[PDB]
Amino acid sequence: TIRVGINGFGRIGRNFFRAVLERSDDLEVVAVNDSKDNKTLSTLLKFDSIMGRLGQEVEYDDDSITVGGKRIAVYAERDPKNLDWAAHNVDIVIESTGFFTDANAAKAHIEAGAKKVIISAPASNEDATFVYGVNHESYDPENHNVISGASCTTNCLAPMAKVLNDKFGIENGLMTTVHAYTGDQRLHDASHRDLRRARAAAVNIVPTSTGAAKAVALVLPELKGKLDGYALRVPVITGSATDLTFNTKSEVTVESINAAIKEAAVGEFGETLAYSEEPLVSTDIVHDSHGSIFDAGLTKVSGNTVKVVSWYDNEWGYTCQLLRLTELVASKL
Amino acid sequence: TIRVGINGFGRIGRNFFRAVLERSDDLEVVAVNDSKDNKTLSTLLKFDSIMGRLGQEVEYDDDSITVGGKRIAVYAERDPKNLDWAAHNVDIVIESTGFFTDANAAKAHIEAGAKKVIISAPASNEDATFVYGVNHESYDPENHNVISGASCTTNCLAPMAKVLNDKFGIENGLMTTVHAYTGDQRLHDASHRDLRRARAAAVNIVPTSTGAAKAVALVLPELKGKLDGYALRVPVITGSATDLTFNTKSEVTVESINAAIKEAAVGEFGETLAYSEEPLVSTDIVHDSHGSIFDAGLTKVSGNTVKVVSWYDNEWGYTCQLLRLTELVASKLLE
Amino acid sequence: TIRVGINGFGRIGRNFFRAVLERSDDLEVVAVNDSKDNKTLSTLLKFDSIMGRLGQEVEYDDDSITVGGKRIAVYAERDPKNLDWAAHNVDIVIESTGFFTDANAAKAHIEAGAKKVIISAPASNEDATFVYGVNHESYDPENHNVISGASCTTNCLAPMAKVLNDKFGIENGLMTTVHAYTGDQRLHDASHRDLRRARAAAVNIVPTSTGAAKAVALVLPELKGKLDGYALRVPVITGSATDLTFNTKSEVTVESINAAIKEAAVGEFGETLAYSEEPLVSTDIVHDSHGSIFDAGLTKVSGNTVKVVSWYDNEWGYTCQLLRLTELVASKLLEH
Amino acid sequence: TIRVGINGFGRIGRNFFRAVLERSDDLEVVAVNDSKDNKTLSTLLKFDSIMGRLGQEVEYDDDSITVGGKRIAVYAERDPKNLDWAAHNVDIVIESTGFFTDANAAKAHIEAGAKKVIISAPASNEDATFVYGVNHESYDPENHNVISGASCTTNCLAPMAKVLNDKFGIENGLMTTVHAYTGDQRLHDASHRDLRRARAAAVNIVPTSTGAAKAVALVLPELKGKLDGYALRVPVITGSATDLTFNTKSEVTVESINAAIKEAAVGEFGETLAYSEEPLVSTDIVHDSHGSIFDAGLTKVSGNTVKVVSWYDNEWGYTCQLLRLTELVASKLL
Ligand SMILES: NC(=O)c1ccc[n+]([C@@H]2O[C@H](COP(=O)([O-])OP(=O)(O)OC[C@H]3O[C@@H](n4cnc5c(N)ncnc54)[C@H](OP(=O)(O)O)[C@@H]3O)[C@@H](O)[C@H]2O)c1
Ligand SMILES: NC(=O)c1ccc[n+]([C@@H]2O[C@H](COP(=O)([O-])OP(=O)(O)OC[C@H]3O[C@@H](n4cnc5c(N)ncnc54)[C@H](OP(=O)(O)O)[C@@H]3O)[C@@H](O)[C@H]2O)c1
Ligand SMILES: NC(=O)c1ccc[n+]([C@@H]2O[C@H](COP(=O)([O-])OP(=O)(O)OC[C@H]3O[C@@H](n4cnc5c(N)ncnc54)[C@H](OP(=O)(O)O)[C@@H]3O)[C@@H](O)[C@H]2O)c1
């Protein structure tokens, strides 16, 4: 029973609350902070447009919600300086507001009396970034305190990149992620700092930038400077694909590329990276707990140019990787 | 030329801008206020996910945008007290932020120099509310200075209700509007004061309240207390339909209900209310300039109970109604 | 264990299959007939854009599919005369192709050795039409052999109409169903006998006819001649609502209308009709097993005119109703 | 006025009809053949979920439609051998059913009195295949009678690939086209020879195959065997992007890739290929008349690996390409 807190009970925060419920034997969410009133908060817990109804009952009052007869403290402090985790013996705070991805801002959780902070996103000034199944062994139970669990796309790309580079070496690579729309995008054409994301999300293919390809280097140093890419946001509510095209010096074939993924995708790592030969479409990978679902039927090769494609549920898959990482932290003060 | 300012360059503000280019010979938009920087504003004006590309070159600088060679002063004041419409000799302000539907607040525009204010929405404390085609002949240029052009749904409902009440007598009625999603709804399940409008707009049927059927009484006072209804937000980006079930003492048939609309839907009034026997779906009424398109194929009659359905592009149709009102105001004394 | 065949392994057929696995102790689907090859048939069982992945393993060979170890025999006969259900000991056939809603055509399943046929749609020339929870107690094991489970919309409307008519009396009413798009509609503007259903389904509000308001008269003959209505197909893949506006002679309030549903919506009937005060949107009723989910928050009253709204998952809720009817047929005399 | 018949009055057929009215001074559609009855056909001409309402009045009866006072003969022959284009003095037939992309089937239109046939798709056994702006100068009026206008995707990729191959040299490249759903796909999970295209089109990203990149070789033989790729079908109703990642021996920068397109995208060729630095999304390119709209803002370079992205309205863009080709045919012998 390692006692967990959630800062920012949004898509990832609520996906995380459910993942813990359905997957963890040893964690407990005992406090959450969120800018929403508790009626809204509990409604959005009980009903979900993507995951469906929560298995259990939810009640609320002015400073709590109660899920399956278990009382949870709730705060509404839009600056985490004004919080007090310590008061609920809270060991870890998932930082999923998306506004405290700077560790200098996030560490504030520690100041409020937390031991760990896992930011549910690419970060800055953090102690360490991890994609579970890729670089989790270099967690430092003593020094690694404010950390990143990286991005959905990085948790898709890195597993697959690592294997294929470990095997054939990647010289250069460029990625397109065709990605479900997310909450930062606008429903109607409206204000946004990014002039494409300003555009009505559910009727547009929307190009946008992503650090996810560069960010791979945070977990695979050997690929620094070797990878870049961008995203096409498309009208599905969840479910995404990472399409990577790359150059190798090795002689390769489709078969050899596919057999390497297949070979590697077993055991504990297989809980992160899956190998498929199924006729998949995006709805088939909704609620899939892998970080990366390699699609063997999409593999292409001309000369020493290779295209490979991997799926991920950007909500649920990512969240399952964030739970793995959290179990690790939780197993070692 | 009558000079117009727009406060709130959003969906309705930008439809209104284009409507003026496309349909007015005597209005010109000379200043706009909005919270966006001018690079953002000009981009959203040039490119539109519903109306397509503006047919004119657009440039911007620190103080302005220029559209087909005409400079438009641009401000970014959250508080309208800080505007200066008089500097631009603006006659009429379209209030389309959604934040100043109280006339006690919208009157700031008048104090900042405007002569008239038309709120793009149900208002309070307003001098008068109008649905063009229904009650605009009661516009009073000396006493009606801050006015409402009502809601999209009311502009769809009121014309059809006037005809049917005038010819048959509506005793009682309940409406459902099946309505395109709008910008306040959430893309992903997230915080909202309305617990249903919180839910991912583009994958849900979302019920929501609307005063639109009660508000008909503002323009047809003979129907106070007689109409109510509600909305179902559905996944289309624009285009809507109003479904009205009502009772009459008159003896009626599908045919006589339909003839009653066809008879009335001519001349000037027919620019507000259309009569159709076409096999319409919502994309067919996208960029229709009527406030109300009556679908004769959907009329049903059971005893003394009648169901009628009228379409409306809640963006462009409503805007064209607002533009009709605007032209009326501009045609008369602005003193 | 009563053994079941499905003719038409489409949206309803495959929902019905999953409903049996998940909800039934005493039925088993052992044979299916469809137009698809076994690879295609198994792919579409295994993977589902709405229901997600089957939680059983699916394999195939060239005369069968295997699901959690159970061999299901597979046919691809366009003409049901050419089937043989008796070779599989099938007592009941679900007729879910959409092409054999005439009971004179569907009776070919009985010629081919079945005992009972349940058409998953409005039918013609049928022995009897049922909405489970409304008129199923009139099922006659000897003489009701080829029957209808009526439509999705009828299974939403009838339970609500029965309670309100029993309590207050319904003089007249007109219905609008706001309904998920269905396989009859076109993805792109293209040929259809219905010129509105011809139009790209996922970008349009599409008006179309519905027989649900006549059909309620079949299971509730007190409402003969009293109801009419239509449908608006909208861009959701499943999930629908029935909006009924009616006149009553009773003096009624929002509260008394709601209380009547809440009072009725209990026990076994409560598995057909639920009563809700939740802030529902369509996704919230996806995979709900009720035929009808009354939304108390949408009730309106103007004098003696009432507007009520009930939800339904037109795929899964209807299928659960159809399963309830199947369980009843299966619980009685299948013989003659 | 050169007189045009349309076989297959579908999405492409009706796009073409409207493209002639809006864009041609010298072509007239005088006859159409389709499976539909005239009520249905006239309705789908008048009303379009993508294009909006036709500007002109539309009437029909048992053997015709009338558009803007112009009478169009209508037929419903499943088999093109039973047609008589000669009886309407038709010179060119647009073959847009999707069923006669084999030239040996499409030549039935010539037996039936047409002089030229333009297949609105990749063909087999055709006299020649053209991407207007890339290879149309090789059109041979005497020998090229049953021709192909290639695919939407090839019309997007080939102009871009020609420019970039000319300037820098393409060793190999692999394409992903993120494409609008099309009529071949299913609305609900349902029968289909392609187990991905079986899946409900408007709620899925759907991978499927395409010969569009190999087919570039037909108009640019120098790229034979150098390109392949596939499609992801996504839930927009029209509007697509071609994403090409390729290898060059050249040392290249983002700026020099972009500059190469900009320099090329001028004059007549620039009606086929546009250069843009705008913050484009798919709805911006709906009803765009170009075959290819190069998005300069998405170009990336890593070492010797280059990624470029061009937009296309797979309906109207393609159709405008197909009309350009048609205009060329109309302007030479027969
Ligand atoms: N969705 C994805 O696919 C995905 C995948 C991987 C990672 N992520 C990352 O995870 C993070 C969360 O994203 P999301 O999609 O869950 O977004 P979201 O639904 O908008 O979640 C953020 C939640 O925190 C609340 N919040 C905002 N500011 C707060 C504050 N100062 N104090 C407390 N609560 C506050 C939010 O806003 P209100 O409650 O004020 O509206 C909301 O409930 C982001 O960094 C995102 O990039 C997202
Ligand atoms: N859309 C419809 O179907 C419809 C139909 C009929 C009537 N209406 C009514 O028309 C009004 C506008 O609706 P809409 O859909 O056009 O909404 P919208 O697109 O959100 O328009 C609002 C615009 O006003 C700006 N704004 C907000 N607060 C402001 C302030 N204090 N000062 C200046 N500009 C400000 C917004 O910028 P930021 O977003 O950057 O703040 C945005 O550009 C509402 O009253 C609505 O009910 C809408
Ligand atoms: N979807 C709903 O919400 C809903 C709700 C209630 C009731 N219903 C009713 O249920 C029935 C089926 O609807 P649905 O949505 O499931 O349609 P669907 O998905 O089209 O299913 C029909 C199935 O029957 C197959 N089929 C067609 N003709 C056949 C034949 N002669 N022999 C064997 N198989 C044949 C089809 O294969 P092919 O596609 O390859 O022809 C398909 O797999 C209809 O009567 C419909 O009204 C549907």
Ligand SMILES: NC(=O)c1ccc[n+]([C@@H]2O[C@H](COP(=O)([O-])OP(=O)(O)OC[C@H]3O[C@@H](n4cnc5c(N)ncnc54)[C@H](OP(=O)(O)O)[C@@H]3O)[C@@H](O)[C@H]2O)c1
């Ligand atoms: N849509 C695109 O984005 C696109 C882009 C470039 C090229 N293309 C190509 O253009 C062609 C047509 O595609 P589309 O999207 O327009 O498909 P579509 O909308 O289905 O058009 C086909 C039309 O042909 C009719 N038809 C079918 N068989 C016929 C026959 N034997 N004789 C006469 N008419 C017949 C169909 O009527 P029924 O439906 O009643 O059978 C329909 O009206 C295909 O080769 C496609 O590959 C399409």
